[PDB]
Write a protein that holds these residues in place. Structure first.
Motif, short mmCIF file in Angstrom:
data_model
loop_
_atom_site.label_atom_id
_atom_site.label_comp_id
_atom_site.label_asym_id
_atom_site.label_seq_id
_atom_site.Cartn_x
_atom_site.Cartn_y
_atom_site.Cartn_z
N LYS A 75 65.24 -30.54 -42.72
CA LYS A 75 64.32 -30.00 -43.72
C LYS A 75 62.87 -30.16 -43.28
O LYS A 75 62.06 -29.24 -43.45
CB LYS A 75 64.50 -30.70 -45.08
CG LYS A 75 65.88 -30.61 -45.74
CD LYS A 75 65.86 -31.44 -47.04
CE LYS A 75 67.26 -31.67 -47.60
N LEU A 76 62.55 -31.30 -42.67
CA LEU A 76 61.20 -31.54 -42.14
C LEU A 76 60.80 -30.45 -41.15
O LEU A 76 59.64 -30.00 -41.14
CB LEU A 76 61.12 -32.93 -41.51
CG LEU A 76 59.81 -33.30 -40.78
CD1 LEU A 76 58.61 -33.34 -41.72
CD2 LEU A 76 59.93 -34.61 -40.00
N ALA A 85 57.77 -37.22 -41.93
CA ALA A 85 58.59 -37.76 -43.00
C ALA A 85 58.87 -39.21 -42.65
O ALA A 85 58.98 -39.57 -41.47
CB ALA A 85 59.90 -36.98 -43.21
N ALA A 86 58.94 -40.04 -43.69
CA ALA A 86 59.11 -41.48 -43.53
C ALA A 86 60.17 -42.02 -44.48
O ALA A 86 60.30 -41.56 -45.61
CB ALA A 86 57.79 -42.21 -43.75
N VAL A 87 60.97 -42.97 -43.99
CA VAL A 87 61.67 -43.89 -44.88
C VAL A 87 61.00 -45.24 -44.65
O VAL A 87 61.17 -45.83 -43.58
CB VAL A 87 63.19 -43.91 -44.63
CG1 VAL A 87 63.87 -44.97 -45.50
CG2 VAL A 87 63.83 -42.53 -44.92
N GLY A 110 57.78 -37.04 -47.30
CA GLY A 110 57.01 -36.24 -46.38
C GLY A 110 55.53 -36.47 -46.61
O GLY A 110 55.10 -36.88 -47.69
N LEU A 111 54.75 -36.30 -45.55
CA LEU A 111 53.29 -36.37 -45.65
C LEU A 111 52.70 -34.99 -45.35
O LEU A 111 53.07 -34.35 -44.36
CB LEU A 111 52.72 -37.42 -44.70
CG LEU A 111 51.22 -37.69 -44.82
CD1 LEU A 111 50.83 -38.28 -46.18
CD2 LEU A 111 50.71 -38.55 -43.68
N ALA A 117 51.64 -37.55 -50.38
CA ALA A 117 53.07 -37.79 -50.33
C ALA A 117 53.79 -36.64 -51.02
O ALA A 117 53.28 -36.04 -51.97
CB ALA A 117 53.42 -39.12 -50.98
N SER A 118 55.00 -36.35 -50.53
CA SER A 118 55.84 -35.29 -51.08
C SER A 118 57.29 -35.70 -50.87
O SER A 118 57.73 -35.84 -49.72
CB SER A 118 55.55 -33.95 -50.39
OG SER A 118 56.31 -32.88 -50.96
#
Ligand code: CU
Ligand code: CU
Ligand code: CU
Ligand code: ZN
Ligand code: ZN
Ligand code: ZN
Ligand code: ZN
Ligand code: ZN
Ligand code: ZN
Ligand code: ZN
Length: 126
Positions: A75-76, A85-87, A110-111, A117-118
């Motif tokens: 998706k990113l 995108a981050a976890v 996501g950034l 943030a998203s």
């Protein structure tokens, strides 16, 4: 044309190695850079401190911070407004951090280009 991802991580980050193995099991071509200086990597890619994690990947120009599921990397790739995108942290149950049947809830965040943030995905805890 398999997807390629460039990962930098510490030599003693075993979860990080597990995550790479989950990606290869999903067909990604992974290059593994052992690097002792992850602050340099995260700062170079503009990973916000508040989203930091154990490892930092790059695919198609966007960063992948932490134990992001492969489905969320796809998706990113599709999202032109996102630079990463981050976890954040190390939630148990995320891929490469699996430790039994119990799972921490976590989100893929996501950034955007301008720093917002998203939420890309939400994962309910078991
Ligand atoms: Cu871990
Ligand atoms: Cu990890
Ligand atoms: Cu890691
Ligand atoms: Zn590289
Ligand atoms: Zn490099
Ligand atoms: Zn080290
Ligand atoms: Zn280094
Ligand atoms: Zn699609
Ligand atoms: Zn595993
Ligand atoms: Zn079980």
């Amino acid at each position: 044309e398999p997807l390629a991802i460039d990962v930098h991580r510490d030599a003693n980050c075993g979860c990080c190695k597990d995550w790479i193995k989950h990606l290869e099991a999903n067909g990604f071509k992974v290059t593994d850079h052992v690097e002792a200086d992850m602050s340099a990597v995260k700062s170079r890619l503009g990973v916000p401190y508040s989203m930091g994690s154990c490892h930092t990947g790059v695919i198609d120009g966007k960063f992948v911070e932490g134990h992001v599921p492969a489905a969320d990397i796809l998706k990113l790739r599709e999202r032109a407004d996102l630079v990463g995108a981050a976890v954040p942290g190390m939630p148990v149950g995320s891929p490469g951090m699996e430790m039994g049947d119990r799972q921490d809830a976590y989100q893929v965040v996501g950034l955007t280009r301008s720093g917002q943030a998203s939420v890309l995905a939400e994962y309910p805890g078991r």
